[PDB]
Enzyme design. Structure first.
Site, mmCIF file in Angstrom:
data_model
loop_
_atom_site.group_PDB
_atom_site.id
_atom_site.type_symbol
_atom_site.label_atom_id
_atom_site.label_comp_id
_atom_site.label_asym_id
_atom_site.label_seq_id
_atom_site.Cartn_x
_atom_site.Cartn_y
_atom_site.Cartn_z
ATOM 1 N N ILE A 145 2.520 -27.821 8.935
ATOM 2 C CA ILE A 145 1.633 -28.469 9.935
ATOM 3 C C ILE A 145 2.487 -29.169 10.818
ATOM 4 C CG2 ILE A 145 -0.367 -29.987 10.077
ATOM 5 C CD1 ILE A 145 -1.383 -29.106 7.659
ATOM 6 N N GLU A 157 -3.574 -40.975 15.578
ATOM 7 C CA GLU A 157 -2.384 -40.547 14.618
ATOM 8 C C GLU A 157 -2.771 -41.214 13.285
ATOM 9 O OE1 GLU A 157 1.162 -41.790 16.411
ATOM 10 O OE2 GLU A 157 1.248 -39.938 17.813
HETATM 11 C C1 BYN Z 1 -1.586 -32.882 6.868
HETATM 12 C C2 BYN Z 1 -0.847 -33.163 8.017
HETATM 13 C C3 BYN Z 1 0.415 -33.188 8.192
HETATM 14 C C4 BYN Z 1 1.082 -33.403 9.337
HETATM 15 C C5 BYN Z 1 0.378 -33.613 10.468
HETATM 16 C C6 BYN Z 1 -1.076 -33.600 10.108
HETATM 17 C C7 BYN Z 1 -1.661 -33.211 9.078
HETATM 18 C C8 BYN Z 1 -3.298 -33.037 8.759
HETATM 19 C C9 BYN Z 1 -1.991 -33.713 11.582
HETATM 20 C C10 BYN Z 1 -3.568 -33.881 11.753
HETATM 21 C C11 BYN Z 1 -1.961 -32.301 12.654
HETATM 22 C C12 BYN Z 1 -1.192 -34.841 12.535
HETATM 23 C C13 BYN Z 1 0.035 -34.530 12.735
HETATM 24 O O1 BYN Z 1 0.617 -35.858 13.053
HETATM 25 N N1 BYN Z 1 0.973 -33.880 11.699
HETATM 26 C C14 BYN Z 1 2.117 -33.601 11.901
HETATM 27 C C15 BYN Z 1 3.077 -33.534 10.699
HETATM 28 N N2 BYN Z 1 4.160 -33.241 10.963
HETATM 29 C C16 BYN Z 1 4.851 -33.206 11.902
HETATM 30 O O2 BYN Z 1 6.217 -32.731 12.161
HETATM 31 N N3 BYN Z 1 4.156 -33.049 13.093
HETATM 32 C C17 BYN Z 1 2.839 -33.414 13.121
HETATM 33 O O3 BYN Z 1 2.150 -33.231 14.144
HETATM 34 N N4 BYN Z 1 2.354 -33.466 9.699
HETATM 35 C C18 BYN Z 1 3.183 -33.623 8.282
HETATM 36 C C19 BYN Z 1 3.977 -32.507 7.919
HETATM 37 O O4 BYN Z 1 2.818 -31.291 7.726
HETATM 38 C C20 BYN Z 1 4.815 -32.467 6.614
HETATM 39 O O5 BYN Z 1 5.860 -33.591 7.062
HETATM 40 C C21 BYN Z 1 5.464 -31.292 6.168
HETATM 41 O O6 BYN Z 1 6.619 -31.814 5.093
HETATM 42 C C22 BYN Z 1 6.098 -30.671 7.233
HETATM 43 O O7 BYN Z 1 6.723 -29.304 6.761
HETATM 44 P P1 BYN Z 1 8.210 -29.077 6.450
HETATM 45 O O8 BYN Z 1 8.866 -29.432 7.894
HETATM 46 O O9 BYN Z 1 8.659 -29.882 5.477
HETATM 47 O O10 BYN Z 1 8.288 -27.513 6.253
HETATM 48 O O1 ICB Z 2 12.165 -42.044 21.881
HETATM 49 C C1 ICB Z 2 11.157 -43.088 21.956
HETATM 50 O O2 ICB Z 2 11.430 -44.256 22.969
HETATM 51 C C2 ICB Z 2 9.871 -42.943 21.229
HETATM 52 C C3 ICB Z 2 9.228 -41.634 20.590
HETATM 53 C C4 ICB Z 2 7.924 -41.944 19.904
HETATM 54 C C5 ICB Z 2 7.146 -40.889 19.006
HETATM 55 C C6 ICB Z 2 5.993 -41.566 18.733
HETATM 56 C C7 ICB Z 2 5.572 -42.681 19.248
HETATM 57 C C8 ICB Z 2 6.304 -43.771 19.842
HETATM 58 C C9 ICB Z 2 7.823 -43.184 20.362
HETATM 59 N N1 ICB Z 2 8.744 -43.916 21.092
HETATM 60 O O1 ICB Z 3 -0.038 -36.849 14.620
HETATM 61 C C1 ICB Z 3 0.041 -37.680 13.322
HETATM 62 O O2 ICB Z 3 -0.579 -38.375 12.817
HETATM 63 C C2 ICB Z 3 1.272 -37.577 12.779
HETATM 64 C C3 ICB Z 3 2.511 -36.997 13.469
HETATM 65 C C4 ICB Z 3 3.710 -36.562 12.521
HETATM 66 C C5 ICB Z 3 4.781 -36.513 12.477
HETATM 67 C C6 ICB Z 3 5.658 -36.193 11.202
HETATM 68 C C7 ICB Z 3 4.978 -36.343 9.921
HETATM 69 C C8 ICB Z 3 3.830 -36.785 9.804
HETATM 70 C C9 ICB Z 3 3.061 -36.943 11.425
HETATM 71 N N1 ICB Z 3 1.699 -37.316 11.511
#
Ligand code: BYN
Ligand code: ICB
Ligand code: ICB
Ligand code: BYN
Ligand code: ICB
Ligand code: ICB
Ligand code: K
Ligand code: K
Ligand code: K
Ligand code: K
Ligand code: MN
Ligand code: MN
Lengths: 500, 500
Positions: free
Chosen positions: A168, A279
């Site tokens: 995700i 977020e």
């Molecule tokens: C459960 C869940 C997880 C994530 C997110 C959401 C949910 C519901 C959103 C609502 C979409 C908000 C968003 O901030 N979001 C999100 C995200 N990771 C990111 O890189 N970017 C994202 O935008 N993770 C977390 C990742 O899913 C985990 O860190 C996972 O471990 C990644 O998989 P991998 O890289 O380890 O394979």
């Molecule tokens: O590169 C940066 O200055 C920066 C990255 C980023 C991502 C999410 C929220 C705030 C942030 N600031």
């Molecule tokens: O959009 C968000 O809430 C959110 C971004 C993100 C990136 C990495 C891990 C968890 C995350 N959550």
């Protein structure tokens, strides 16, 4: 098809659990669906199924909100998560996390290719869809786009074919045939994107599958190791090989019962405006102007009467907390154990906005190490904060065996009374930081570095001879026979059910 | 006589509120009374009145437990506190604290001497009582004595007669005619004791009054300023001069309706074993071997059918949290305002075990100061941690105007998401520390110094141009007309009372 292996079956399971509200009157995807869902998440109400979504055409789409959020009762608090995994609805967090870790020392069970599935019931080519014409939700009033992607799984594969990642990551509609989204280090979608960019020959073949098998969306939310194909980990966890169909326009494979599939490419060169978004930490910074990765959509396939799951994320409690926080904690527990650290349990307290992880220590093992707080804190922090599983976590709280880390009240008690500010902590400034936390990306210091701490809530004798206190509580400060008498006479004396 | 001015009337008020359980069957003061009371405090149940206490003789004594603890309902959560002060039972914390601060810029109303009162209905001289023969409770199974004194007020006066202090400090029975207790800096009983010890001529004239006017026990629990006689502060707060009678054996004055009065001396030379005790932070360290102050009892007077109030303190929630924590927070709010700091509100979150105080900032005023986090943190910490009102508080959390500091969930959210560990904090090692916190007195560092921190949970633009976010919650991320529609249709759609 079982609930944990088929999203459509999962929706039925929630209905049968009396954990679903079917809304059959028109609901607006512009804020209304998400507002209802937000209210559900803030109150632990039943999941909403929007069967009549203003702008739904030719089957695209219904919405299920709050797919992984909490139930009101204590007894089945995590029942929606349990329904992702074939667990009883009364399952504890420990049992859910143990299920999610169980495949870590099993052989993978690779997926099975089948010729077709429900996700092929309908298709729209490059001339037949417009992503701006679908009922994509505006989830928060200041969001910078309509976030189609909050609970689907991105599918990308290493150039050499050896690793196929499911995860995700958010994404929003950019125009009729593109999305923009977050693709940031150290996430596996970013790691794979970097491999394609270094090869430099083509855009990344990509698919985004919504309404996937619940056990798959759980693994998609968990930081399983680098190079591990989520499909085979889910196969091992569930004991069943997942059935996948080939994409029509590329050679990726999607779950056969996916509700909706987008097929296309993740650019190695293009970007576009992304965010802001409400977020996981509870904030949106209106107008933030960031560039994100850009995805081109070439084809949509979908089930008849397709359902799009949606996370209306923000303040407590939603999928970002229940799944992303808890599953990171689970991986941290394993990481610590694999580094010979005497950790029994880990959980990201909801009260910390899942920015802390509490680590329960086996203090018998700790005593045999003949170490000190300063040394042990540093060792734990070095293991966790130098690893991807530690990315999102800024405070580790070390607690002894008397604390149940799944109970935030008890973590807060231990932190507040056993860790002396400054002296019992070690700060980590030269580690990757999580910029989404407001005090990082919108704070006083570097967005991407530092701001981490190990807080030692072990007491001194926990390193040496053993716990030297009793709690001043009903459980510990009265003998057993008195406690039972008090309980037995409670209602008789005139004082005030487990399920409720 | 009104409830806030007469303990006997207060007990009736709780009965009438349906906030009392009268236990008329025999209850053991050895642990049983305190265990019931502990269970009450952990569950926010009705206050227990033990009318039939094993070992009660010739009127000494009944016990009221949990006199200042919480009620279950949200609507009258603080009703027992409100009943100490003539406030409606629905009073908010803000209103209770404002009542307790109201006398700070009023002329005192000195007490009125009357010739007799109910506290003179019975007397026992130096040949007629034995404190080991009274039904003094063992409150926690590892306590080092029977703690007669958990909710009475010590009365001591400066050698020059100009300041008469009323305060709660614990004390336990040492032998037939002595107590031992805590008398520690910077507490006013200690400050006055030091004045007598420097004069060196005699032991301190002393009285300990139990079951005093509720408004008086509130002031006894609050760090009002040095040199301020609590009786005249309570007079001003209540608008009524308190009626006091002279002691029989000294020239101190006690409330006329006191349930039980001990008269004697606090030694300037003697000590004896004191503690351990199950304390406000939730712990007891069995066998701790400390010396405490020693009190000689020369006379007991008491009301017919005397009632001893008792605090069964420890883990949440009891008088140590509701009164000592909150009232310290109140004084800190005023202290900050009197030092020209833009603080509107202060509260000690229960989740912090009342070791934190959250300070709500008027950020309009903060912006006009044109300052920075580092500077402002230092200024706030210097004011608070160099003053007696800051003694018990080890972490100050600065929050902006959107946070309700009386709501621990919101304080925890702000702390966890707006204060970067290390960079947004200032540690204070050269201030008095509170040794009762386990990480102080039983920790890695000096028991009496340091271990304090100011944690700045103000965001950067709160110093400059104003809040630059909206919360990702139902309240802030949806327009008013949509929110009201969702609420209006909530039960119709199929989703789930203020008093409850
Ligand atoms: C459960 C869940 C997880 C994530 C997110 C959401 C949910 C519901 C959103 C609502 C979409 C908000 C968003 O901030 N979001 C999100 C995200 N990771 C990111 O890189 N970017 C994202 O935008 N993770 C977390 C990742 O899913 C985990 O860190 C996972 O471990 C990644 O998989 P991998 O890289 O380890 O394979
Ligand atoms: O590169 C940066 O200055 C920066 C990255 C980023 C991502 C999410 C929220 C705030 C942030 N600031
Ligand atoms: O959009 C968000 O809430 C959110 C971004 C993100 C990136 C990495 C891990 C968890 C995350 N959550
Ligand atoms: C409400 C309350 C307050 C206190 C206590 C209790 C209760 C119920 C005990 C259950 C008896 C536990 C005990 O640890 N205890 C206690 C104590 N202060 C001490 O110096 N010593 C004590 O042993 N305070 C706090 C003091 O009452 C306040 O700090 C007050 O401000 C002092 O008055 P003053 O010195 O400012 O005049
Ligand atoms: O016994 C305890 O809980 C306790 C001791 C003490 C001393 C000072 C302030 C508050 C206090 N509470
Ligand atoms: O003087 C010290 O070493 C000390 C004082 C104290 C008071 C309460 C709890 C632990 C303590 N340690
Ligand atoms: K994953
Ligand atoms: K510690
Ligand atoms: K006082
Ligand atoms: K800050
Ligand atoms: Mn992965
Ligand atoms: Mn005083």
């Amino acid at each position: 098809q079982p609930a944990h292996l088929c999203f459509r079956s999962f929706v039925e399971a929630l209905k049968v659990d009396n954990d679903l509200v079917e809304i059959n009157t028109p609901i607006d995807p512009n804020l209304e669906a998400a507002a209802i869902t937000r209210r559900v998440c803030e109150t632990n109400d039943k999941a909403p199924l929007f069967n009549n979504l203003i702008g739904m055409k030719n089957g695209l789409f219904r919405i299920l909100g709050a797919p992984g959020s909490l139930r009101k009762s204590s007894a089945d608090r995590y029942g929606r998560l349990a329904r992702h995994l074939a667990l009883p609805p009364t399952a504890s967090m420990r049992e859910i996390l143990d299920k999610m870790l169980s495949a870590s020392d099993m052989p993978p069970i690779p997926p099975t290719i089948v010729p077709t599935g429900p996700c092929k019931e309908n298709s729209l080519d490059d001339s037949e869809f417009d992503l701006t014409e679908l009922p994509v939700p505006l989830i928060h009033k200041s969001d910078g786009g309509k976030y189609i992607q909050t609970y689907g799984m991105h599918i990308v594969q290493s150039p050499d074919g050896t690793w196929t990642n499911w995860s995700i990551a958010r994404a929003m509609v950019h125009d009729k045939n593109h999305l923009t989204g977050l693709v940031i280090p150290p996430q596996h979608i970013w790691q794979i994107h970097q491999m394609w960019k270094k090869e430099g020959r083509s855009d990344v073949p990509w698919a985004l599958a919504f309404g996937v098998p619940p056990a798959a969306i759980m693994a998609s939310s968990m930081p399983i190791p680098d190079g591990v194909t989520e499909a085979g980990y889910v196969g091992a966890m569930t004991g069943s090989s997942l059935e996948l169909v080939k994409c029509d326009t590329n050679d990726l494979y999607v779950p056969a019962t996916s509700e909706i599939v987008l097929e296309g490419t993740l650019s190695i060169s293009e970007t576009g405006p992304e965010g802001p978004f409400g977020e996981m930490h509870g904030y949106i910074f209106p107008g933030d102007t960031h560039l994100g990765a850009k995805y081109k959509v070439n084809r949509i396939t979908y089930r008849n009467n397709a359902i799009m799951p949606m996370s209306s994320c923000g303040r407590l409690t939603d999928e970002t907390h229940t799944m992303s926080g808890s599953l990171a904690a689970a991986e941290i527990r394993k990481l610590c154990q694999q580094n010979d650290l005497p950790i029994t349990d880990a959980f990201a307290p909801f009260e910390s906005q899942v920015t802390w992880v509490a680590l329960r220590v086996d203090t018998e093992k700790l005593r045999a190490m003949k170490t000190t707080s300063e040394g042990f804190r540093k060792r734990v922090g070095d293991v966790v904060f130098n690893h991807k599983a530690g990315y999102t976590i800024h405070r580790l709280v070390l607690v002894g065996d008397d604390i149940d880390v799944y109970e935030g009240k008890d973590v807060l008690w231990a932190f507040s009374t056993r860790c002396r500010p400054g002296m019992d902590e070690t700060l980590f400034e030269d580690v990757r930081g999580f910029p989404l936390i407001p005090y990082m990306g919108h704070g006083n210091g570097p967005a991407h570095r530092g701001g981490k701490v190990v807080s030692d809530a072990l007491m001194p004798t926990e390193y040496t001879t053993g716990r030297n206190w009793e709690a001043a509580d009903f459980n510990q400060s009265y003998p057993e026979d008195l406690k039972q008498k008090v309980l037995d006479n409670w209602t008789k004396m005139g004082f005030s059910h487990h399920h409720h």
